[PDB]
Design a protein around this nucleic acid. Structure first.
Ligand SMILES: [Mg+2]
Ligand SMILES: [Mg+2]
Ligand SMILES: [Mg+2]
Ligand SMILES: [Mg+2]
Ligand SMILES: [Mg+2]
Ligand SMILES: [Mg+2]
Lengths: 96, 179, 127, 14, 283, 56, 211, 8
RNA sequence: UGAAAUUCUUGGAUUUAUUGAAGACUAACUACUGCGAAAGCAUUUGCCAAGGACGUUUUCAUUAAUCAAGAACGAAAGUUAGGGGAUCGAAGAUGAUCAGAUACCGUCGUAGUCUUAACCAUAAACUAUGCCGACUAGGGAUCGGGUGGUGUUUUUUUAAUGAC
RNA sequence: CGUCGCUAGUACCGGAACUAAAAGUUCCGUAGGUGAACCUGCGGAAGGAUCAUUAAAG
RNA sequence: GUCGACGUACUUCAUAGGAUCA
């Protein structure tokens, strides 16, 4: 138990975007390749789509998206990717 | 071939691997080198002796002791066996603090940089330089030919001083081609 | 019938010394270094240099009457590296092969409880 | 250059 | 290597050089020759010092078959090593590594140029231009200002140079003083060196250093010897007399408690005269 | 500023004249460049001994 | 023009009676023109295993200084004790507290000396915690106990008696018994002995030691 | 295990 | 040193052994664990005062939270005046200036590094994350205190403590 | 195959003789800088890629 | 003086992402 605590403590301190980005990408591959995640039923997709329409949480009217857009911070490539990442994720939930 | 003895104290964290690998350690020592092998559980030290009536190679005892010592430092068995097979392998040892006085997270990141993600950087140095590297906390041991260990040491030291792994990796390809 | 000396091996970065002395350490029996056995200053720390130096002292010691030596291997120590280098390791192996009986091997590197500053500076050394 | 542990043992490479 | 590509700054440099039609121009660091062609257009004749034979050949090819071809002359070698001809104006975009020697060489030419337009990095140029009491006032500033007058022409940025360097640049004008002021260069520089080891401390503290006392005592003994006065030559014979001399001169000049970085030319001249009065010669 | 500068110029001229009153050569005097060294080699010691012998 | 060993002469070193094996090798010195003056003050360090002929003392060294010469025999006396570096590096381990004490004391022979003792905490038989750290109060108490013990044995004994106690390691067991109630310990050892000052030399007290 | 605790 | 050369060296260098002197620093144990308002704090022993947490069927009874003004401390570097000056070392000097993984290396080294009495008041002074109070899931590790056991061990007379 | 050349040397009175000549990482604070397209000293940060072994009072 | 710092007023560079089709 100590060994996981020491390793978990050290990985906790590293909070670099590039490091965390690489780990996240590799995790999504492993879960995708091993199909750890269960298939979504049609009813599950409908409920998810319903909440997205109810809220409209993944458009550029959000506080963060509006803050970046109105102040020329999205002209940069990296912050534009995050905005587009958010927008494609919203589009996924909108799919029928 | 006079009666001589060597004693190699095993640190506690290497005793259990010594147990699981003992079956593959005494055969080469007792057969090829004609050495009398034993471990003193009371002292927890591996004892090797020359058998005057049987042992013939004068350098067998010292050759065996270095092989035990290499396993003791943390090198895998097969890599340690290379000391028995060959006669031109040496172990280079140095500490991180010798290169640069690093403390706290700076020391942790230096060790992480040397090993690299999934140990890739360490393997990259090992393959290019034809050496084996054991990264024991802030203590680094390198095993290989004399000219080879120096090349690996320079690549390691550049990582300690702060050189990014990516640039060191390219340098490994260049020297690898020269080799 | 068995006379002991002491074989002091000083394994630095740029050279290796093999010094054989009586038990006390006052009297020198034979001092040979890597430089005296090699043509190019680059190879003085080379293991090959140590082997020649070790063999020369081993031959000389047998002439004197010394038939066994206790090995006291050491590095530069101090604020610098504490482990003997391959030059020292090579010298030990050659001495064993020489037939000279090896009594006891111990590391006597000067290790500081805590020392002065190291010559590198804040940014390090040994590029 | 290989970035994984070499299958050949150090004696084998030499 | 870094090569300028902005034509406006080159035109400005050549214009502010103010090349009279009877002027011979020493052009260091010719490079491709963007400056050289324009200097040739409005000069008697140009002598160029180039290190790279390939670049000299390319310049020769460019100027071949042109009305200004006979005017140009190209010297091949290292600028510091070469012994240079008479030149009226210096216009250089040389590598900054030889910036400091170049300046003093221009100062110590047997007939120094009346004007020179030199490009340096921003820090070096500002240290050249620094005035007494400023943060960057240094030995270079005092020495050059004694031997010349340096003014700021323009600030050349990073974008102008391809590939971009890590340091910004600036063009300055150096005007050696004619007639040369009559002070020995060695003694001026020696005094400054003794006093500028730490420019924001008291000058007395500058003279407290034991090695400085040793040097000054040896100089005093040599001075007594040249005057045919007999001097013991022991290591510590004259330590106590030189210490007293230094204390008295520092006190009377009132410069003991003044920081070197806040002392102007006249203060150092007064100190030099006082030390010469009491008998201590620096270099 | 102009009047201050002119007064400084006159003072500088007077001081430089008085300096010409007190002027010598600098070949034999040890340069202040040696302030950092603090120890000399046998080559430097021999050079100094030869120079002093030439001085007599 | 002269091989130095033509003029050298060999001398046999003999150890005190407190050690089992008196023969401890030999040394050399230039032949008298005297050899005694160079010989006197010479210090030789030897492992206890050789002197006792038992591998139980493989990690302890004794320094003996030459004090008298008679007919090629160098009569030496105890000068110091120390541990081998490998053993000390072995004992010092992670996840435990190191308790070290030193005491300066003079024997009944006016031999002023300094004893350094070392000990480490150990985990109980049924202990499950990773570490066996001792609170600073326990460390101070153990250090006090060790200091009192060492002073008691040194003051009430001679130097020869002190060495006779050092060889069998009785002092370590006494420390273990005294500190048993305070906190469990392991690797209790008299790490080092220094001989700081010496009394006036008495050749009788040396001959008696050598029989 | 041959040689584990005795000479082998 | 990539190879050299400034450097020391038959008046004995480097290395060896017995000592002695000086000034710094407290390895391994050492762990994001402990302490402090923060900066920071690591050899033993003694003295001086200070402190959190815990236990309390002790005492006062709103005395409290946050805080312009104002005050105490404030890494490193740095300034004034003494002391010290081993190591490392800005500045300065000097050898070499050949070779791109080892490409800035070497030697001497002033100020400094240390200390006493005062100045300076800045840090990626970082959890890039105000202080006080309430509430909202499970798990087992660790540090300090307390309670409970008819638990192991020691006290090798018991025991009571201590350690688990 | 000849003449004068050019390089080195030997002599003689610019001149005139002889011999030889296998080449084509990113920073923060502070303090400095005179081979400054940038360097250096001291303290700090990650906003920098953790592999192996590990109860051996077993 | 094509001078430095600041204040003010402006200019400019960093925008594409997914799906289908050829
Ligand atoms: Mg603690
Ligand atoms: Mg309280
Ligand atoms: Mg204050
Ligand atoms: Mg002072
Ligand atoms: Mg901090
Ligand atoms: Mg809260």
């Amino acid at each position: 138990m100590f060994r996981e605590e020491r390793k978990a403590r050290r990985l906790k301190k590293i909070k670099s975007k590039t490091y965390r980005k690489i780990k996240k990408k590799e995790l999504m591959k492993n879960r995708e390749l091993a199909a750890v995640s269960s298939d979504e039923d049609n009813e599950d997709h409908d409920i998810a789509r319903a909440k997205e329409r109810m809220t409209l949480k993944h458009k550029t009217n959000s506080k963060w998206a509006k803050d970046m857009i109105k102040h020329g911070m999205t002209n940069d490539a990296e912050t534009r990717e995050e905005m587009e990442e958010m927008l494609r994720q919203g589009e996924r939930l909108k799919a029928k | 071939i006079k009666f001589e003895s060597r004693k190699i104290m095993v640190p506690p964290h290497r005793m259990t691997p010594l147990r699981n690998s003992w079956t593959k350690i005494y055969p080469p020592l007792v057969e090829h080198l004609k050495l009398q092998v034993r471990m003193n559980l009371k002292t927890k030290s591996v004892e090797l002796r020359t058998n005057p009536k049987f042992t013939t190679d004068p350098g067998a005892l010292q050759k065996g002791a270095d092989f035990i010592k290499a396993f003791t430092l943390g090198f895998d068995l097969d890599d340690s066996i290379a000391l028995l097979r060959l006669d031109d392998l040496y172990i280079e040892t140095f500490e991180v603090k010798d290169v640069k006085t690093l403390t706290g997270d700076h020391l942790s990141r230096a060790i992480g940089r040397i090993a690299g993600k999934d140990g890739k950087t360490k393997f990259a140095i090992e393959n290019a330089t034809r050496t084996r590297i054991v990264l024991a906390d802030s203590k680094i041991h390198i095993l290989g030919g004399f000219t080879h260990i120096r090349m690996a040491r320079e690549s390691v030291v550049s990582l300690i001083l702060g050189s990014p792994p990516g640039k060191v990796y390219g340098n490994l390809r260049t020297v690898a081609s020269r080799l | 019938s068995q006379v002991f000396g002491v074989a002091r091996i000083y394994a630095s970065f740029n050279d290796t010394f093999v010094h054989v002395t009586d038990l006390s350490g006052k009297e020198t029996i034979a001092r040979v270094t890597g430089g005296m056995k090699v043509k190019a200053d680059r190879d003085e720390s080379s293991p090959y240099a140590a082997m020649l130096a070790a063999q020369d002292v081993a031959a000389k010691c047998k002439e004197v009457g010394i038939t066994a030596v206790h090995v006291k291997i050491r590095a530069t120590g101090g604020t610098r590296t504490k482990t003997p280098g391959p030059g020292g390791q090579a010298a030990l192996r050659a001495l064993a092969r020489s037939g000279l009986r090896i009594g006891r091997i111990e590391d006597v590197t000067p290790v500081p409880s805590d020392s002065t500053r190291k010559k590198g500076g804040r940014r390090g050394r040994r590029l | 250059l290989s970035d994984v542990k070499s299958s050949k043992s150090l004696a084998e490479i030499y | 290597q870094h090569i300028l590509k902005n034509p406006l700054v080159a035109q400005g440099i050549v214009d502010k050089a103010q090349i009279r039609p009877s002027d011979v121009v020493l052009e260091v660091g010719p490079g491709t020759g963007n400056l050289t062609v324009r200097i040739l257009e409005q000069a008697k004749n140009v002598v160029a010092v180039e290190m790279d034979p390939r670049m000299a050949a390319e310049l020769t090819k460019r100027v071949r078959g042109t009305p200004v071809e006979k005017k140009l002359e190209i010297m091949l070698g290292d600028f510091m090593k070469t012994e240079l001809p008479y030149f009226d104006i210096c216009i250089s975009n040389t590598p900054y590594q030889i910036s400091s020697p170049l300046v003093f060489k221009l100062i110590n030419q047997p007939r120094p140029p009346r004007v020179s337009i030199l490009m340096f990095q921003r820090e070096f140029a500002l240290r050249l231009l620094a005035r007494p009491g400023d943060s960057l006032y240094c030995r270079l500033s005092a020495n050059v200002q004694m031997w010349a007058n340096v003014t700021h022409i323009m600030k050349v940025g990073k974008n102008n140079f391809r590939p971009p360097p890590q340091v910004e640049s600036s063009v300055v004008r150096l005007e050696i003083k004619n007639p040369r002021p009559q002070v020995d260069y060695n003694e001026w520089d020696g005094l400054l060196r003794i006093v500028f080891v730490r420019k924001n401390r008291t000058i007395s503290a500058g003279f407290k250093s034991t090695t400085v006392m040793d040097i000054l005592e040896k100089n005093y003994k040599t001075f007594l010897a040249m005057n045919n006065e007999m001097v013991d030559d022991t290591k510590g014979s004259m330590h106590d007399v030189v210490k007293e001399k230094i204390d008295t001169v520092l006190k009377e000049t009132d410069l003991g408690d003044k920081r070197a970085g806040k002392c102007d030319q006249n203060d150092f001249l007064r100190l030099l005269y006082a030390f010469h009065q009491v008998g201590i010669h620096f270099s | 500023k102009f009047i201050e500068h002119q007064l400084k110029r006159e003072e500088r001229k007077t001081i430089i004249g008085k300096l010409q009153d007190y002027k010598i050569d600098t070949s034999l005097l040890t340069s202040s460049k040696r302030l950092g060294e603090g120890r000399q080699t046998k080559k430097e010691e021999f050079k100094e001994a030869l120079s002093l012998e030439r001085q007599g | 023009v002269v091989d130095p060993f033509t003029r050298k002469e060999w001398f046999d070193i003999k150890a005190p009676s407190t050690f089992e094996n008196r023969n401890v090798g030999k040394t050399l010195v230039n032949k008298s023109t005297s050899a005694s003056d160079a010989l006197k003050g010479r210090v030789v360090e030897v492992c206890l295993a050789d002197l006792q002929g038992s591998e139980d003392h493989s990690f302890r060294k004794i320094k003996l200084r030459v004090d008298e010469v008679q007919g090629k025999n160098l009569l030496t006396n105890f000068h110091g004790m120390d541990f081998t570096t490998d053993k000390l590096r072995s004992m010092v381990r992670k996840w435990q507290t190191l308790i070290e004490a030193n005491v300066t004391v003079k024997t009944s022979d006016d031999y002023v000396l300094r004893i350094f003792a070392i000990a480490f905490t150990r985990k109980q038989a049924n202990q499950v915690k990773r570490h066996s750290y001792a609170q600073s109060s326990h460390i101070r108490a153990i250090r006090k106990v060790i200091s009192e013990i060492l002073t008691k044995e040194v003051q009430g004994s001679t130097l020869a008696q002190l060495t006779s106690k050092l060889i069998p390691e009785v002092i370590n067991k006494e420390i273990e018994n005294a500190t048993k109630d305070i906190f469990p310990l392991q690797n209790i050892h008299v790490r080092k002995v220094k001989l700081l000052k010496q009394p006036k030399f008495d050749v009788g007290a040396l001959m008696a030691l050598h029989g | 295990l041959p040689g584990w605790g005795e000479w082998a």
